[PDB]
Design an enzyme around this catalytic site. Structure first.
Site, PDB file in Angstrom:
ATOM      1  N   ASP A  11      45.549  29.737  28.247  1.00 42.20           N
ATOM      2  CA  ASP A  11      45.756  29.644  29.690  1.00 42.20           C
ATOM      3  C   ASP A  11      47.206  29.259  29.952  1.00 42.20           C
ATOM      4  OD1 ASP A  11      44.899  29.623  32.536  1.00 42.20           O
ATOM      5  OD2 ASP A  11      45.338  27.471  32.329  1.00 42.20           O
ATOM      6  N   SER A  12      47.661  29.491  31.191  1.00 45.68           N
ATOM      7  CA  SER A  12      49.012  29.098  31.542  1.00 45.68           C
ATOM      8  C   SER A  12      49.193  27.595  31.549  1.00 45.68           C
ATOM      9  CB  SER A  12      49.380  29.640  32.926  1.00 45.68           C
ATOM     10  OG  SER A  12      48.429  29.229  33.881  1.00 45.68           O
ATOM     11  N   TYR A  45      51.852  30.988  36.393  1.00 52.76           N
ATOM     12  CA  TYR A  45      52.135  32.389  36.225  1.00 52.76           C
ATOM     13  C   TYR A  45      51.957  33.187  37.506  1.00 52.76           C
ATOM     14  CZ  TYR A  45      51.810  31.935  31.025  1.00 52.76           C
ATOM     15  OH  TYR A  45      51.934  31.698  29.680  1.00 52.76           O
ATOM     16  N   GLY A  46      51.052  32.755  38.388  1.00 48.84           N
ATOM     17  CA  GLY A  46      50.579  33.600  39.469  1.00 48.84           C
ATOM     18  C   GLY A  46      51.597  33.916  40.553  1.00 48.84           C
ATOM     19  N   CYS A  78      43.005  32.585  31.564  1.00 46.71           N
ATOM     20  CA  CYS A  78      43.812  32.760  32.752  1.00 46.71           C
ATOM     21  C   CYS A  78      43.504  34.094  33.413  1.00 46.71           C
ATOM     22  CB  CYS A  78      45.288  32.681  32.368  1.00 46.71           C
ATOM     23  SG  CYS A  78      46.406  32.884  33.745  1.00 46.71           S
ATOM     24  N   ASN A  79      43.171  34.043  34.697  1.00 44.31           N
ATOM     25  CA  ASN A  79      42.883  35.251  35.438  1.00 44.31           C
ATOM     26  C   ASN A  79      44.156  36.045  35.678  1.00 44.31           C
ATOM     27  OD1 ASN A  79      40.849  33.042  36.328  1.00 44.31           O
ATOM     28  ND2 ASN A  79      39.841  34.916  36.930  1.00 44.31           N
ATOM     29  N   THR A  80      45.293  35.348  35.789  1.00 46.10           N
ATOM     30  CA  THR A  80      46.563  36.032  36.036  1.00 46.10           C
ATOM     31  C   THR A  80      47.012  36.772  34.780  1.00 46.10           C
ATOM     32  OG1 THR A  80      47.201  34.502  37.788  1.00 46.10           O
ATOM     33  CG2 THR A  80      49.006  35.761  36.670  1.00 46.10           C
ATOM     34  N   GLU A  98      46.017  21.002  41.392  1.00 47.28           N
ATOM     35  CA  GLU A  98      46.694  20.262  40.329  1.00 47.28           C
ATOM     36  C   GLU A  98      47.182  18.896  40.792  1.00 47.28           C
ATOM     37  OE1 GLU A  98      49.591  22.642  38.192  1.00 47.28           O
ATOM     38  OE2 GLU A  98      48.098  24.063  37.481  1.00 47.28           O
ATOM     39  N   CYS A 146      40.447  32.856  39.709  1.00 50.32           N
ATOM     40  CA  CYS A 146      41.507  31.935  39.309  1.00 50.32           C
ATOM     41  C   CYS A 146      40.867  30.756  38.601  1.00 50.32           C
ATOM     42  CB  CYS A 146      42.316  31.429  40.504  1.00 50.32           C
ATOM     43  SG  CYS A 146      43.608  30.279  40.130  1.00 50.32           S
ATOM     44  N   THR A 147      41.512  30.280  37.532  1.00 53.78           N
ATOM     45  CA  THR A 147      40.969  29.173  36.748  1.00 53.78           C
ATOM     46  C   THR A 147      40.755  27.926  37.590  1.00 53.78           C
ATOM     47  OG1 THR A 147      43.261  28.713  36.098  1.00 53.78           O
ATOM     48  CG2 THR A 147      41.860  29.752  34.442  1.00 53.78           C
ATOM     49  N   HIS A 148      41.551  27.760  38.640  1.00 53.69           N
ATOM     50  CA  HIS A 148      41.523  26.492  39.334  1.00 53.69           C
ATOM     51  C   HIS A 148      40.382  26.421  40.340  1.00 53.69           C
ATOM     52  CE1 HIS A 148      45.346  26.278  37.466  1.00 53.69           C
ATOM     53  NE2 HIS A 148      45.769  25.235  38.156  1.00 53.69           N
TER      54      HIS A 148
HETATM   55  N1  LIG Z   1      45.652  30.211  35.363  1.00 58.93           N
HETATM   56  C1  LIG Z   1      46.072  30.906  36.581  1.00 58.93           C
HETATM   57  C2  LIG Z   1      46.297  29.873  37.685  1.00 58.93           C
HETATM   58  C3  LIG Z   1      47.583  29.095  37.484  1.00 58.93           C
HETATM   59  C4  LIG Z   1      48.777  30.045  37.313  1.00 58.93           C
HETATM   60  O1  LIG Z   1      49.164  30.713  38.322  1.00 58.93           O
HETATM   61  O2  LIG Z   1      49.309  30.137  36.176  1.00 58.93           O
HETATM   62  C5  LIG Z   1      44.998  31.879  37.025  1.00 58.93           C
HETATM   63  O3  LIG Z   1      43.854  31.739  36.552  1.00 58.93           O
HETATM   64  O4  LIG Z   1      45.251  32.781  37.854  1.00 58.93           O
END
Ligand SMILES: N[C@H](CCC(=O)O)C(=O)O
Ligand SMILES: N[C@H](CCC(=O)O)C(=O)O
Lengths: 256, 256
Positions: free
Chosen positions: B9-10, B41-42, B72-74, B152, B183-185
């Site tokens: 993950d990021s 990353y997003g 990570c979804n991104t 966060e 998105c992970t969050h």
């Molecule tokens: N992990 C990213 C969220 C945080 C990021 O933008 O890196 C996602 O799941 O899209």
């Protein structure tokens, strides 16, 4: 006017400093580098940020700059000492010039001063220590982390910014007479921060805001005997660790 | 119950996927790597993100893993295809399993589906393309960038989050039956999102929310014939490009 200069920032926030530099028309060749692949720095740890700052020097080495401006308050607070140790040119950050601005502009050493910044900048006590060393005794600090992503979304007005300001500012004990904008991004909400304090504390005149870009321009003018308005058609090159076209499009917006 | 797996993950958001994995007790050795020096990353560009994804493969090289989970979804949206081309082991991201969960749980192909994600995930149209290819006809998307930094800061409630949801959700013309937490969050505000749609539209039951972590667990358990509850005491290792002590401390909170 003669000197080829570098401007380093973690991303696009450094355009607030570049705007101040361009307005003064004091330099003729400017190389801007934003570490947009890795921004923000402010939410990260000292070790990481110090290494980021050394890697910024590597970027500028082939450009034969004669002075580096660290426009980023976070890199200035955490990485500047290490960058200067490993640097054959002067490196000027944005914290010390603001301490000079406060000295000049705030003679009441007991005036309540509020330092705003990223989490890393505030947790470093860079500002508090320098202000205490100059005799200021009524110094408060406040990390306002979400201002950064809000400003990068171009949310400079409206309900969401008002609620964020309320969120960070309502817990303050002391009403400030001086607010230090200890982050590249915060000039873009300077009037909203002023309007927040006038509205909620029945002030007629807002607290004094210290702008990092204006303070470093003033310092460099004095230190290098630079004629203002001498360089009306500078050369400005943009560089980034992320997509350079994206960073240049944001430069167009921030420098407008 | 025997594969050495990696989870990428990021940053710390991928702990929402790790939580789903640990609960299923299907894997015995998990190597977690968060790119905490460069998160998010997003908000960044496709070129940068694709290269971040390839660099994650470099991190995992000495670990000699047998499967990589891109939590990570991104990164899943932008980098997965290239990483898969450049890898001898299987790489599974969090988008396609969520498409399977929708096929399983949403039989009405005209059900209005809302994809929430980072700016990059949404701009990629990864979800829309896959849903459309599966015959879903009523797909909307919405980038909700500021949810990430809010989450966060552990702002999972209160007027700032409520105002932020209003900012993103008020312009919606279609009321979703299904909301993809792309998105992970976003699992950390899932109830709040459910509550928002029930209130501002009087619903007596919330839209259905699709959680990326649960969807990849279900996929992996079928793909690899993994018996849930087989690995009660897994070895879990944390790695980070930023300060790993900071990342490990956030794991305690996200996995609680
Ligand atoms: N992990 C990213 C969220 C945080 C990021 O933008 O890196 C996602 O799941 O899209
Ligand atoms: N440039 C940073 C703000 C963005 C970041 O956190 O990197 C500063 O001046 O503090």
């Amino acid at each position: 006017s003669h000197m080829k200069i570098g401007v380093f920032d973690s991303g696009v926030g450094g355009f607030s400093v570049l705007k101040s530099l361009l307005k003064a028309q004091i330099f003729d060749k400017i190389i801007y580098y934003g570490d947009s692949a890795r921004v923000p720095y402010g939410t990260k740890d000292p070790t990481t940020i110090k290494q980021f700052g050394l890697e910024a020097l590597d970027f500028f080495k082939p450009h034969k700059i004669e002075l580096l401006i660290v426009a980023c308050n976070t890199a200035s607070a955490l990485a500047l000492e290490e960058m200067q140790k490993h640097s054959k040119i002067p490196i000027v950050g944005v914290i010390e010039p603001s301490i000079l601005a406060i000295k000049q502009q705030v003679k009441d050493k007991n005036a309540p001063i509020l330092v705003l910044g990223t989490k890393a900048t505030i947790q470093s006590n860079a500002y508090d220590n320098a202000l205490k060393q100059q005799g200021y005794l009524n110094v408060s600090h406040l990390a306002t982390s979400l201002f950064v992503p809000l400003i990068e979304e171009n949310i400079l007005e409206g309900e969401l910014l008002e609620t964020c300001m309320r969120y960070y500012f309502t817990p303050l004990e002391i009403l400030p007479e001086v607010v230090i904008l200890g982050c590249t991004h915060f000039p873009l909400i300077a009037q909203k921060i002023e309007g927040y304090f006038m509205e909620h504390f029945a002030l007629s005149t807002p607290p004094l805001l210290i702008h990092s870009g204006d303070a470093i321009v003033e310092y460099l003018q004095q230190k290098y005997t630079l004629k203002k308005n001498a360089c009306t058609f500078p050369k400005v090159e943009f560089h980034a660790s992320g997509d350079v076209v994206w960073l240049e499009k944001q430069a167009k917006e921030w420098l407008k």
